[PDB]
Structure formats: structure tokens, C-alpha cells
Amino acid sequence: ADLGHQTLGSNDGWGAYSTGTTGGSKASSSNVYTVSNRNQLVSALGKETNTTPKIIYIKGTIDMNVDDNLKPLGLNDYKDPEYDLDKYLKAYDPSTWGKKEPSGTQEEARARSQKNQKARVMVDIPANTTIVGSGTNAKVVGGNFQIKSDNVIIRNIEFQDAYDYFPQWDPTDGSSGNWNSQYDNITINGGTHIWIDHCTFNDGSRPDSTSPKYYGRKYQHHDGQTDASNGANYITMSYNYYHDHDKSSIFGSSDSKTSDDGKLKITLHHNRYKNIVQKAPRVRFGQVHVYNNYYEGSTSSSSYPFSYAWGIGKSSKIYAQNNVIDVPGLSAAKTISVFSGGTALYDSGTLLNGTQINASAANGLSSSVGWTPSLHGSIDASANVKSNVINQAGAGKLN
């Protein structure tokens, strides 16, 4: 079968469980579309009721920040009449406003401005859908694909810069406050049976060191790359290339969402992470199989300095095998970050700068996660991961 008709292998990760992930492979010829702009894309997807098997080919670059006549939309097109960044900055300055959540005129105007952008950039993908990039240059710029449905395949697309024009100031986030934005490249919100393969994720032509700092904190226009929340389950992410971005992948959005326990069954394999700061992934609750991935970065980078790879969150059950990390000077314990409620991690074959390490033992965690992965393809030796991943991961390697 061709790229549009290929399905997830019967043993290829948690996405292969139960009914498996076949996307729109059973589509008739009338439900095979070739799209090259936002209008064609939204028309082919249809609404939530469009559950008929469908195959969508993305040809060329699709900019999501455009109006219905395909005219590019910027800051001034989305801005609410009352919103003014200079007035926003003056109103919520920590020295005069304090550490309380922004409220009043400028925050209400900013929120309305954000909703104007949300309407163009966020699109929902209906059940039984395959979205694949045509050739080696298929790109989605500015969009946020949201998957709340079952049985979806997304492959061979470069997703760039899911950019929020109106970041919100949150003085209570962390120790010194932080600027927060709303859009990811892909948001899995309760979606099941999903395969994300051979895609590339980056911040395009607007990386984070092109943003100024306000209140001593970077004015952050980005959020996640591939995030999963609210009971998302049975997902395989393979051969993806994540690079030049801060917060990559958050699986499980909150410590109080106890209904995520038993869900968030995700398999990550053969992915490349280059110049990724943190959360790759950060996990709460889920049984996540992480194998044959390659992480490379530098703690002294001037754009995206490495902080940590795996985030061991509340009740997480990460099972990691033969992963390779190349970050000069990093100690074994600092490859991961442990959060309250995180007490277990299984890791075998971890290579840090050419030497075998045990991340779990270095952090005093238990190795008993209560499960062993049953669905997986062949496992590469740690010695061959770097070459395999650099040569095969990312969009444009297939077509």
C-alpha cells in the first residue's frame, strides 16, 4: 500500500491495542483529498460527524494564520480594539500589581484577542482519518491540530511555529512568574488509537531567542509540540524529529486528574530530540514505553539549553529501554527530573555521553513500575540508536 493507505503495524506500540490504528485506510476514492491551503484543509476535514474513512494529502505549505480569502493575518488583525501591549505591561507589572492573577481591562482585552486567533489556528480532526504529507516539503505553519476522536494517523509533515500572538502573564507560575501561551502543534485531548510518525516539529522562523524578555522572563509565544491529556490512550509516536523548542511533550495535564490512571498508554520510539529544553516527555499516571530515542543538546546553549529529558511525575510508570543521550557534562542523575508523587522508573541500556548509566538508581527511585510492554517491534542495541535515528527520523524521509 501507498503512504495514504498504510496502517499501524499490528505490534507497533500501544496504538496497536484492541482495534488498532487504521486511520482512513478504508476510504473510497471520493474521500481522498489533496489540499494546499487552509480553506481546502478545513473543507476536507468537515465536522465531528464526518466519521467516514478519509485520506488527506497535504501538498506544500499550509499557513493557518490566514482569513477566508487566504490573506495573511498578523497581530493587528487579531487584536481586540482595547488591547495594548504597553498598557498590559504597565497594568500587571509585579512591582505595582503584585503576585495576583491579572484581571481588569487589559487582561479581558487580551483574552478576547486570543479567542480571535484561536478560531483560525485550531482545527479538530474527526475519527477515521489519515493525514499525510505529499513529497518531501509538506508543511503546516501556525496551526494546532486537536484530536479528541478515535483512529487517526498523521505522517510525513513538518509542523512549524504554533505561535500565540497574546501570551498571558502568570505571576504565580513557578518562582518568578512566567508568560504562557495556548497552542501546540498537536494536542491529543481524549483521543484514542493514534499514530504520529515521520513528522518534524520545530519553532520555524520564530525561535524563542527572537522574543524579548518582559519582567525578567522570556515573552513565550509557544507551548507544546505533542501533548496528551484527559484520558488520551493507545498512541504510538515513532520516527519523529523534535528540535529547537522549549517544552516538548506533556502526557497527563494535572495531578488531581485521577481518572488518567490506567490511561495515557503511549509508546515513543525512534524519535530524535535536538535542542529541546524540557519535558520530553513529562509524564503523570501513564504506562509509557520509551525506547530507541536519541537526545542531543547543550546546557550552555544560547537559544534552547538542555534542562532534562524525562519528567517523572505523579504515579508515572515509564518503562525505558536503550535510549541514547548526548549532552556534554551532564551527570547521570540530571538526565531526568522527579516531581512530587513520582517514585518509580524502569530504565535499561541508557547511554549518557558514551557510558552506560542507570537514571532510576541515581535518583533513588524504584524500578518496579508494575508492567512490561507487550506491544513493540524489534529493539535496536543502544550502540546503533544514534545512526538509526539521525538517518531515519523526521518528515521528508518517506513520500
User: Element (H or E) spanning 54, and its range?
Assistant: strand 54-58
Instruction: Specify the residue, 57 or 242, whose C-beta has the smaller distance to Ca ion.
Output: 242
C-alpha cell at 127: 475519527
Of 262, 236, 205, the closest CA to residue 20 belongs to 236
What's the full length of the chain, in residues?
399
| Residue corresponding to grid cell 489519515 | 130
96 CB burial (10 A radius; 0-12, 13-18, 19+): exposed
Q: Are 195 and 236 contacting, i.e. CB atoms less than 8 angstroms apart?
A: yes
Q: Are 330 and 300 contacting, i.e. CB atoms less than 8 angstroms apart?
A: no
C-alpha cell at 174: 513557578
| Residue corresponding to grid cell 481588569 | 104
Q: Are 298 and 325 contacting, i.e. CB atoms less than 8 angstroms apart?
A: no
CA-CA distances (angstroms) from residue 258 to 138, 226, 231, 314, 318?
A: 39, 21, 10, 10, 17
C-alpha cell at 191: 483521543
What is the spatial distance between Cα 194 and Cα 233, in angstroms, rounded to a whole number? 8
C-alpha cell at 189: 485531548
Of 370, 306, 307, the closest CA to residue 343 belongs to 370
Nearest distance, CB of residue 223 and Ca ion, angstroms: 4
Radius of gyration of the chain from its Cα atoms, rounded to whole angstroms: 21
CA-CA distances (angstroms) from residue 95 to 76, 175, 214, 389?
A: 29, 15, 13, 48
Instruction: Specify the residue, 223 or 380, whose C-beta has the smaller distance to Ca ion.
Output: 223
Question: Under DSSP, is residue 142 helix (H, G, I), strand (E, B) or coil?
Answer: coil
Nearest distance, CB of residue 211 and Ca ion, angstroms: 18
Nearest distance, CB of residue 340 and Ca ion, angstroms: 21
Instruction: Specify the residue, 53 or 252, whose C-beta has the smaller distance to Ca ion.
Output: 252
Nearest distance, CB of residue 84 and Ca ion, angstroms: 27
Annotate 32-62 with DSSP letters as a single string.
Answer: EEEE-SHHHHHHHH--TT--S-EEEEE-SEE
Nearest distance, CB of residue 185 and Ca ion, angstroms: 10
Instruction: Specify the residue, 161 or 227, whose C-beta has the smaller distance to Ca ion.
Output: 227
Instruction: Specify the residue, 25 or 185, whose C-beta has the smaller distance to Ca ion.
Output: 185
Nearest distance, CB of residue 254 and Ca ion, angstroms: 12
Nearest distance, CB of residue 298 and Ca ion, angstroms: 25
Instruction: Specify the residue, 168 or 360, whose C-beta has the smaller distance to Ca ion.
Output: 168
Q: Is the dihedral of CA 214, 81, 99, 225 positive or negative?
A: negative
Q: Are 98 and 74 contacting, i.e. CB atoms less than 8 angstroms apart?
A: no
Instruction: Specify the residue, 196 or 324, whose C-beta has the smaller distance to Ca ion.
Output: 196
Nearest distance, CB of residue 247 and Ca ion, angstroms: 8
Nearest distance, CB of residue 183 and Ca ion, angstroms: 8
Nearest distance, CB of residue 159 and Ca ion, angstroms: 14
Instruction: Specify the residue, 184 or 246, whose C-beta has the smaller distance to Ca ion.
Output: 184
Pairing of strands 192-197, 233-238: parallel
Q: Summarize as ranges the residues that interact with Ca ion (CB under 5 A).
A: 184, 223-224, 227
Instruction: Specify the residue, 253 or 392, whose C-beta has the smaller distance to Ca ion.
Output: 253
Nearest distance, CB of residue 227 and Ca ion, angstroms: 4
Instruction: Specify the residue, 224 or 349, whose C-beta has the smaller distance to Ca ion.
Output: 224
Instruction: Specify the residue, 197 or 223, whose C-beta has the smaller distance to Ca ion.
Output: 223
